[PDB]
Design a protein around this ligand. Sequence first.
Ligand SMILES: [Ca+2]
Lengths: 66, 66
Amino acid sequence: MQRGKVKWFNNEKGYGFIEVEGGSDVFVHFTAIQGEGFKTLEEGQEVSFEIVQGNRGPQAANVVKL
Amino acid sequence: MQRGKVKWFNNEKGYGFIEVEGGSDVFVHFTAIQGEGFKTLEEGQEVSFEIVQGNRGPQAANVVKL
DNA sequence: TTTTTT
DNA sequence: TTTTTT
Ligand SMILES: [Ca+2]
């Protein structure tokens, strides 16, 4: 196990490097990253969903990218 | 269940709207989105990790944002 | 990205 | 975002 700080990361390429004090940078591919990822939708994305009603209006539930 | 097409989604705000044929747009909060999210690292992020050797050299495994 | 239009 | 330097 090692501690480091992300040197840079490129979201188009899916990788970057971690800097380590007194050592070489370490390559990181996105698939190695733990934890929940960032949830987003792109303009034009086809989706299925359920409609529900909240106190501020209707909204989508169970939104699946088709 | 309904189908639609994302009209716009704002990553800073964490929400957007889904267009549906013949109906009002439907609001979508990011927390309603299903599937794995986008895995990324931000420059300067402190991380822990393990090192493994692939056929192009060492790389990080089990990368956790601290 | 933490809640109703762009 | 699909694999070694911004
Ligand atoms: Ca307006």
